[PDB]
């Protein structure tokens, strides 16, 4: 078991790379309402396997570029 | 290196030393790794005044920690008393 | 740090006898105890809620001879302590060393007792204690030291005390001039005229 996060692929244009929103459903500090917050992450994906809209599991790793410190581990729900 | 030494605390003319493990570079009362005892030089009779956790001290020494002269003296005193 | 003014003046203002005189001579003979001090004494204005609370607090403070900052500290300590706050405050005040000396009878007034304590006449557990605010604890012996044991004031005070009502919470030996503070008094043990509740409200406005 390794630490990993799931997220929808917000973009897949930059080659070998995808952007993966990691929406978390946090509670508001004061008002107590539960707000959908988002976390964009530049994820490395070799072979350009991922599509846009694709759900994808990712893990943290040594930084591969200026913005890219995550790698994909497995794709799920990769329908179009 | 890591050392075991007294840190001065208390009031003016009434010192109370906290025995602390700390990186020698750090200031006397500053950053410290572990607090492994105390020593109260003005402590009266019918008071403990000294207390050194000897096991922890032994462990740190094993790790390679130097000991202040005063702390060494305290250790000797504790051993004799016990 | 001490009130150095007229004492029957304070008593008249309060209404009650605050025991600021030895009690050889009656307060009615020493002053117009009924009439309040000053040009406008012969008048009793209707007192507000704040006013009544303040008067009670003043009474207690005068009785013991504690200034306001010290009194406030006492109240805070009492509040912090578990149980009833007014009761705690009364207990602390009683606990004071000058007060215990007075109760034992090594002084006609608390002013006299305080003087003795300041001047180093009183030993607590065979150790000369000098502070009047010193909290005496249960099972504490408190004694006149020999140099003050020859004092005619001390013996006179003892006689007066014998006349007075003896406290249940102390045990005192007149020949030895030593008394054991067995326990801090309970509210039923202290005087009923004191309305501690007013004081609590005032310091909890």
């Amino acid at each position: 078991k390794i630490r990993t996060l799931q997220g929808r692929v917000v973009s897949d244009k930059m080659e070998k790379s995808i952007v993966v929103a990691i929406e978390r459903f946090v509670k508001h500090p004061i008002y107590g309402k539960f707000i959908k917050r988002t976390t964009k992450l530049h994820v490395h994906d070799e072979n350009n396997e991922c599509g846009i809209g694709d759900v994808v599991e990712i893990r943290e790793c040594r930084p591969l570029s200026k913005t890219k410190s995550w790698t994909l581990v497995r794709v799920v729900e990769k329908a179009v | 290196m890591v050392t075991i030494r007294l840190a001065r605390h208390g009031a003016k003319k009434r010192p109370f030393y906290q025995v602390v493990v700390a990186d020698s570079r750090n200031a006397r009362n500053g950053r410290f790794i572990e607090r492994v005892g105390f020593f109260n030089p003005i402590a009266s009779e019918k008071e403990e005044g000294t207390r050194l956790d000897l096991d922890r001290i032994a462990h740190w020494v094993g790790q390679g920690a130097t000991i202040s002269d005063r702390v060494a003296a305290l250790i000797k005193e504790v051993n004799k008393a016990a | 740090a001490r009130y150095l003014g007229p004492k029957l003046k304070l008593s008249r203002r309060e209404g009650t006898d605050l025991f600021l005189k030895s009690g050889v001579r009656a307060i009615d003979t020493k002053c117009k105890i009924e009439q309040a001090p000053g040009q406008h004494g012969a008048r009793k204005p209707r007192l507000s809620d704040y006013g009544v609370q303040l008067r009670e607090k003043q009474k207690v403070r005068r009785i013991y001879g504690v200034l306001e900052r010290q009194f406030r500290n006492y109240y805070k300590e009492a509040a912090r302590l578990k149980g009833n706050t007014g009761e705690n405050l009364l207990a602390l005040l009683e606990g004071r060393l000058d007060n215990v000396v007075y109760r034992m009878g090594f002084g006609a007034t608390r002013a006299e007792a305080r003087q003795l304590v300041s001047h180093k006449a009183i030993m607590v557990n065979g150790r000369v204690v000098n502070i009047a605010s010193y909290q005496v604890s249960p099972n504490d012996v408190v004694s006149i030291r020999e140099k003050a044991k020859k004092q005619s004031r001390v013996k006179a005070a003892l006689e007066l005390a014998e006349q007075r009502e003896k406290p249940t919470w102390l045990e005192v030996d007149a020949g030895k001039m030593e008394g054991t503070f067995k326990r801090k008094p309970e509210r039923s043990d202290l005087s009923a005229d004191i309305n501690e509740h007013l004081i609590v409200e005032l310091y909890s406005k």
């Binding site: 008002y31 107590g32 309402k33 539960f34 | - | -």
Partner: protein, 129 residues
């Protein structure tokens, strides 16, 4: 739109008690039935009766004691605009323990006291006094 059926049910109960209605009827649901069951157990209503197959109707029989309503107050707490969840140490005591608080736990809808006894929190549906 109807956006809160539990709230609607609570409101119906309140209005019935106000208006001295003997029974109150509303579209049945499983959550509603569970809440009703809890209410009956605690004794704030006399009875409930689900009736129908295609679109079933819950019928609660309301409770009166001395001419006046048994359910003195009945407020929704968690609601769609603002969900409320509490932990076992944070579970509320309604009317200092006299009234009950309906709590949806992992082990089904139960009163606050029951939930506390079990040792788990959940969605605080409503207070009833």
């Amino acid at each position: 739109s109807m956006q809160d059926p539990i709230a609607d049910m609570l409101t119906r109960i309140r209005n019935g008690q106000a208006a001295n209605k003997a029974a109150v009827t509303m579209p049945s649901s499983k959550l509603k039935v569970a809440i009703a069951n809890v209410l009956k157990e605690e004794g704030f209503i006399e009875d409930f009766k689900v009736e129908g197959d295609t679109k079933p109707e819950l019928e609660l029989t309301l409770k009166y004691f001395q001419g006046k309503a048994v359910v003195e107050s009945i407020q929704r707490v968690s609601r769609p605009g603002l969900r409320i969840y509490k932990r076992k140490d944070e579970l509320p005591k309604v009317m200092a323990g006299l009234g009950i608080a309906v709590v949806s736990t992992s082990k089904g809808v139960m009163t606050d006291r029951a939930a506390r006894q079990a040792g788990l929190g959940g969605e605080i549906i409503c207070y009833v006094a």
